[PDB]
Structure 1
């Protein structure tokens, strides 16, 4: 198994993945914060305070009651200052011109500020092909939702295998997966895993035993009194899990 830093130098690595992997190595963080807040002040305050501890800030811009593009400009400044990527967890699922406009256009103009977005694969590769039309020109990346832990989840084996093929077939845009474990043996792909809690699975299980790269964590940090301490606890846990599996 190769280090984040070496993976960033792989021949076939996507530029956004490379950028992500470098900063994870520099900062010793594979923690993605899920910033599930409804006010812009809260979002930016968290971004600024926890920025040093994270590789990535995951947003839902569509729950921001006071969204404006200027709010996103300020978030970008923090992302640049503190060195993290912005991932809008929009879970795109439409196709064709609809999905291109949902990514590029409307009020949110997600593509203008989101380094990464994600997509569901169930509609077939039209979802990624449509996002691509926007995303390639704008030098972005995409994550495919390959597995799901939620009760009744219908991502079968075939479903998951099909996610992985679609990513491979679209490697110029798709940079990895949202998943419960390693789903692809190609080190150019990132694996991001939600449902992580210290007390759900633990960072040790997700990164150590299941082979994922990045933990996504929301309530475990956000609902805590001291968010920085919490973020740091999660960072140290996931990073050690990572160092432990390298050799």
Structure 2
């Protein structure tokens, strides 16, 4: 039956990145991942600073930052360490192994130098995980596999989802869990991170679908909610982040018994 985050952090087969994450989740009482979908470095950093105490993780799309530099990432690393959260680059790699290795290590972004976690789609087959790990393992990084998507018409279903779970099991030295809408694996060493979350049900006008923290954490058995616009679009993002943190945490407690 259901183990606490602190207990999972001590599971035998647990990745040190997952263990570090589960520990600060337990310590800070948050299972909220902020999706910091903004185009300005000054806004990203002011969000990370102010909301840092409320979150276990900050999720970035650096390819959307109009003023990206590696110095912005350095300041973000300082905030992650000071407020205690992980940095997750939402790169959604979906290319052959030979290419994703360079996209993760190199270019302008040098994602691997600053991101604790990245994610990958499984559509290319396991070579995508093998390419990323050749870079990630040396650097003690973790990866999430996209077993399910939140958007209308997603093909990440059935046999596809099963393939994701299988691939994660075969590369558990590097893969720490899933992007999914539910619990897709019974193994408690794996983390389940769920995007497509807002307090009000609904969606956007480009196929995003939203479910509540209570539905996702409490009934669907996921671990962490990933929240973008639900927080970002509020006048007071701190208040918003706290609302989401409390909903996700209490749903987690109430799942625990």
TM-score normalised by the chain length of structure 2: 0.95
| Whole-angstrom distance in 2 between the partners of 1:89 and 1:225 | 25
- Asked whether the 8 Å contact 2:182–2:192 carries over to 1, the reply is yes
| Whole-angstrom distance in 2 between the partners of 1:171 and 1:137 | 15
1:110 is matched with which residue? Answer: 111
| Whole-angstrom distance in 2 between the partners of 1:21 and 1:56 | 11
CA-CA distance at 1:96 after TM superposition: 2.7
Q: Deviations over 1:9-52 (max 9, x none)?
A: 11110000000000000000000000000010000000000000
State the secondary structure of the residue aligned to 2:33: strand
CA-CA distance at 1:127 after TM superposition: 0.5
CA-CA distance at 1:94 after TM superposition: 1.2
Q: Deviations over 1:193-236 (max 9, x none)?
A: 01111111100000000000000001110010010000000000
In the TM superposition, what are the counterparts of 1:97-136 in structure 2 within 5 Å?
97-136=98-137
Q: In angstroms, what is the RMSD of aligned CA positions? A: 0.6
State the secondary structure of the residue aligned to 1:17: helix
| Whole-angstrom distance in 2 between the partners of 1:96 and 1:180 | 26
CA-CA distance at 1:70 after TM superposition: 0.5
CA-CA distance at 1:97 after TM superposition: 2.4
2:249 aligned with 1:239: yes
- Asked whether the 8 Å contact 2:97–2:129 carries over to 1, the reply is no
State the secondary structure of the residue aligned to 2:119: strand
State the secondary structure of the residue aligned to 1:142: strand
| Whole-angstrom distance in 2 between the partners of 1:156 and 1:3 | 28
In the TM superposition, what are the counterparts of 1:1-247 in structure 2 within 5 Å?
1-199=2-200, 200-247=210-257
State the secondary structure of the residue aligned to 1:57: strand
State the secondary structure of the residue aligned to 2:186: coil
| Whole-angstrom distance in 2 between the partners of 1:166 and 1:174 | 9
CA-CA distance at 1:83 after TM superposition: 0.3
CA-CA distance at 1:156 after TM superposition: 2.4
More moved, 88-97 vs 174-183: 88-97
Q: Which runs of 5+ in 1 are unaligned?
A: none
Structure 1 stretches of 4+ moved >4 Å = none
| Whole-angstrom distance in 2 between the partners of 1:61 and 1:148 | 20
- Asked whether the 8 Å contact 2:144–2:175 carries over to 1, the reply is yes
More moved, 52-61 vs 87-96: 87-96
CA-CA distance at 1:149 after TM superposition: 2.8
State the secondary structure of the residue aligned to 1:182: coil
CA-CA distance at 1:95 after TM superposition: 1.9
Aligned length: 247
CA-CA distance at 1:155 after TM superposition: 1.4
CA-CA distance at 1:148 after TM superposition: 1.5
TM-score normalised by the chain length of structure 1: 0.99
CA-CA distance at 1:79 after TM superposition: 0.2
